[PDB]
Amino acid sequence: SKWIKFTTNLTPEEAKIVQYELSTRDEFYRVFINPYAKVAEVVIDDSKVNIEELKEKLKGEVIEEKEITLQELI
Numbered sequence: 001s002k003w004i005k006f007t008t009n010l011t012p013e014e015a016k017i018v019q020y021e022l023s024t025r026d027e028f029y030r031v032f033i034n035p036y037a038k039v040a041e042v043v044i045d046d047s048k049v050n051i052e053e054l055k056e057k058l059k060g061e062v063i064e065e066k067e068i069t070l071q072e073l074i
Helices: 016-020 051-056
Strands: 003-005 041-043
Touching (some): 016 051
């Protein structure tokens, strides 16, 4: 899996991420994002590498911080 953070803000922004990683089609897989909760923690199964993901979430970038793309925490 991956546990990456994001922007905790706009319901229709935790929505925009779906389109950015939508290009990631045959590799982008299990997605769970919360465009409701301003949480911005994404545990996603996606097997590209994610360096492109890193790019797209790097467009919000305001407070998206660290690429500790680990499981979850514990």
